[PDB]
Write a protein that binds this ligand. Structure first.
Ligand SMILES: Nc1ncnc2c1ncn2[C@@H]1O[C@H](COP(=O)(O)OP(=O)(O)OP(=O)(O)O)[C@@H](O)[C@H]1O
Ligand SMILES: Nc1ncnc2c1ncn2[C@@H]1O[C@H](COP(=O)(O)OP(=O)(O)OP(=O)(O)O)[C@@H](O)[C@H]1O
Ligand SMILES: Nc1ncnc2c1ncn2[C@@H]1O[C@H](COP(=O)(O)OP(=O)(O)OP(=O)(O)O)[C@@H](O)[C@H]1O
Ligand SMILES: [Mg+2]
Ligand SMILES: [Mg+2]
Ligand SMILES: [Mg+2]
Lengths: 320, 32, 321, 321, 33, 32
DNA sequence: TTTTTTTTTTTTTTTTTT
């Protein structure tokens, strides 16, 4: 629902322009905005803020809904194809749009390769698990290689010229720059149809920008705002969010039940924000192991997938 | 329909006042 | 890049730039990439002034989005430093990539230092033969830098030995604090002349003994992460190629046996995620060595054989075959 | 070097200097190379005082950059002590190199200690004949030091036997802690008289028994790293050559069959990475022995033949041929 | 054009307030001593 | 020209509080 | 009331056949 539909009952273009400059680009963003934030920006009074919230609630649902209708709506969710049948069956169809999906594991386990694969499969038609939408790639490590996209695009039949022309790439140099890029992302997604958001990675910059134990409170609080912004992007536009994460070795040997001496970075802020978490491990040669650590509905399981020149796919008999 | 290049160009203009046709990404020591 | 002197606009005085230079920021890119919190610790920098600095810097340095087509065009113009070996050049897809960190790890006498010495010469030869037409900066922490090797290698590529030795800045680090401090001095040098390569050899040698025991492990890892982040910023600011070598340790806990290699590199997860490309070196027969790509975002996991000769790293010869 | 008394500038008094000396710092270079953490551990030293010392030391000792052309000229004037054999010197390209650590490993009776006895005399002869014109310091961890060998060797080189014996300092280590603590006393004698060689024979003799089982393996290797780091600092401050011997053990596993040598040095990866030049020793026919260059930053892999006589290490004779 | 040596001089001057013409690297024992 | 013998004497008491002239070094059983 | 981090490290030979 466009934000311009609020041009009724005394709200003029001047107020909407102020809302646009404050980071609100859709009617949903106004509706979900707490009353405190509306009063923070200048040019809007208490009467205007109450009018905006009442008008926004008229175009955006806020009431109750039966579980039967909600189940019917979620059965029409678009699941982006991952390119591998093993992962597609494991996740019940693949990466689900409108929710946060997190990937963590040791290096060379294929987290970035999957993100490159999804960046191409989000443009193929819906009949083959696509999204028919553009992609947005925010890279905080400087490891975005467009040469991978061309090789993958040929496999799926896409024109390499168009595949590179439908992907937007940005690099974040600091935590403040990383958060501000989402504000620019909101404007872009409000003009053209997007279907995927990729952050690679999340904790790469927060690890170094905030140094010491005294800044742990600030570090975790800034991270909470980033995930809140990411969830708002999925709510307003429905685009899938895929974020990657590193791992850290637990030096404390007090517990030994877990065979993995490595745990994801982020703490409970990361663990509670992510709807779905996947753990990656290295197998034989090109093979890798993916395990669903946490998910509200998918059972805990495991599968095997392989990294190939054309992207991520099921392991072949040659590897077997 | 707007091309992605022009859509990106306007977004950079309205957020940084940067002429995207003159200020470009560079990745390393170029051959030119 | 963008000179820092271009920011003297809209009330920015001489002292403002001088204070920034003393704080380690020497390019308009550096101030643009610096977080707002970091700019606040400089004395004489106010709340309003810091915001003005960020806005002006962002006007000269791109911060927005770009189409993957345009970034692909720019990456196709990237200069790759030749390694002197055709087999190794093909393995890396052209040579050592500029604007990214390459990590070499392995056992001893595996040729890590020999490769770095060869790159110190190949960074000065013209572009058409795989060079970069620049100078080299060689930061050393173990005391194993020999200008004698550069004399032999420079003769192979047609370079004058005196000129080759006059375009390589050398500096030795003696502790972790000195190792990080040398980077600020490098940035000032790099802003006044064209550099194309910087070498740290090796990284974890000093960190192993400066931090002792499990009680100082957390402090050691965080100090290392600060050093690696500073190295990455140099690549973004100036576009040069960073080469860092690493040592190896033999794992003792035989709980896992899937990996035939019982040796792993020093650094933990901080070093593993920081490096863009990692190469593993092993000894073959005689003067031959084995190289294998371990981690790379755009290179398949392959293996190639290269040999070390008195004129530098080269392809294996039929005499050894 | 630069005496530590020259730091008596800008609020530095006897008490500040005396506290530093008791902590193991005896030269200006020792203060400069020391990290900030170590200086803060010394009682009576404040953060303001510690930072002042670093600034003063940096202005006195070279802590900055240099061109590789100048470093080449500096290394061309380096003193190399002859080993008593023309074949050994030619293979080493001059002899044992001062300012670096040289490691000798092999079986028993191969000739590791005999070479060290020869080096203990060649370090006193004048520079014109490959000497060092300085005293030697010998640390023995096995009780195998024999001054009788020095007397016969000194007669060959024409030195006065009384003067030869009076210019060598001998100490014996009984445990790993005692061995490391001997280095602190060694440093003090360095600052008061001219020495030219450090010999440790052997390094891993006491580490093998003082640490038992895989439980103490981590502690054993960490202690060894500190010992080798201290040896490196001695070479940096004073320029004395460091020669260390080592023992070998058999390779029970036959997987590494591609290496004809079934024995490897003791010390793990820390010992291998710390040494600058490694030399292997094997027994030849009769009194002849074989020496091989295993790892070296600038020396190609090659072998040579030397012999052991009454008057020390020398070239093999045609009579033995 | 300014040589690299010259460029080394000012940088050492700026950071360490030291004259590189007075202090130089010494890598061991020199024959000239 | 501090003889090595005297220099060693100073070092021992500095580090060990031992009179070197009284506490000598023994290699084993001696005929004395 | 708030709110986690982070890996190290190799040992060491046996034993004639007719
Ligand atoms: N073109 C290619 N063909 C085949 N395999 C490839 C190709 N490019 C990369 N790989 C494989 O992918 C690996 C890199 O994995 P990936 O880039 O996804 O890392 P990651 O899990 O995101 O880790 P990190 O960011 O911590 O380094 C390489 O080590 C290699 O095995
Ligand atoms: N002039 C030369 N000619 C031929 N080969 C040489 C020459 N100099 C060195 N080498 C070879 O290179 C080896 C040294 O390798 P190098 O010092 O580069 O290894 P490294 O991995 O850096 O070692 P370290 O762990 O000690 O730092 C020698 O053992 C020898 O085989
Ligand atoms: N006076 C001498 N005259 C001739 N040869 C001698 C003399 N003394 C010793 N040797 C030779 O030197 C050998 C001892 O070598 P050396 O003491 O250097 O061995 P090493 O490698 O240090 O061994 P270890 O492991 O026992 O310490 C003897 O076996 C003998 O061959
Ligand atoms: Mg990655
Ligand atoms: Mg090396
Ligand atoms: Mg011996």
């Amino acid at each position: 629902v466009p934000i311009e539909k609020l041009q009724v009952n005394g709200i003029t273009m001047a107020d909407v322009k102020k809302l646009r400059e404050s980071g609100l680009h859709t009617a949903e963003a106004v509706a979900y905005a707490p009353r405190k934030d509306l009063l923070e920006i200048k040019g809007i009074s208490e009467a205007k803020a109450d009018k905006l919230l009442n008008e926004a609630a008229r175009l955006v649902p806020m009431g109750f809904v039966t579980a039967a209708d909600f189940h019917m709506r979620r059965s029409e969710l678009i699941c982006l194809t991952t390119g591998s049948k093993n992962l597609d069956t494991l996740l019940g169809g693949g990466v689900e749009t409108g929710s946060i999906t997190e990937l963590f594991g040791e290096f060379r386990t294929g987290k970035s390769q999957l993100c490159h694969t999804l960046a191409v499969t989000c443009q193929i038609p819906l009949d083959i698990g696509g999204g028919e939408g553009k992609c947005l790639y925010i890279d905080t490590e400087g490891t975005f290689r467009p040469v991978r996209l061309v090789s993958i695009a040929q496999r799926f039949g896409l024109d390499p010229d168009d595949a590179l022309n439908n992907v937007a790439y940005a690099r974040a140099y600091n935590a403040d720059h990383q958060l501000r890029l989402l504000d620019a992302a909101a404007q872009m997604m409000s003009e053209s149809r997007f279907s995927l958001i990729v952050v690679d990675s999340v904790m790469a910059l927060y690890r170094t920008d905030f140094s010491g134990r005294g800044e742990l409170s600030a570090r975790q609080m800034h991270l909470a705002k980033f995930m809140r912004a990411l969830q708002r992007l999925a709510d307003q536009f429905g685009v899938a969010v895929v974020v990657t994460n590193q791992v850290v070795a637990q030096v404390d040997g007090g517990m030994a039940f877990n065979p993995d001496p490595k745990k994801p970075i982020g703490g409970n802020i990361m663990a509670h924000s992510s709807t779905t978490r996947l753990g990656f491990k290295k197998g034989k040669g090109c093979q890798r192991l993916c395990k669903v650590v946490d998910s509200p509905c998918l059972p805990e399981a495991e599968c095997v997938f392989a990294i190939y020149e054309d992207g991520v796919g099921d392991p072949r008999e040659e590897d077997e | 329909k707007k091309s992605l290049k022009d859509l990106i160009y306007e977004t950079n203009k309205t957020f940084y006042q940067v002429d995207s046709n003159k200020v470009k990404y560079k990745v390393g020591l170029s051959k030119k």
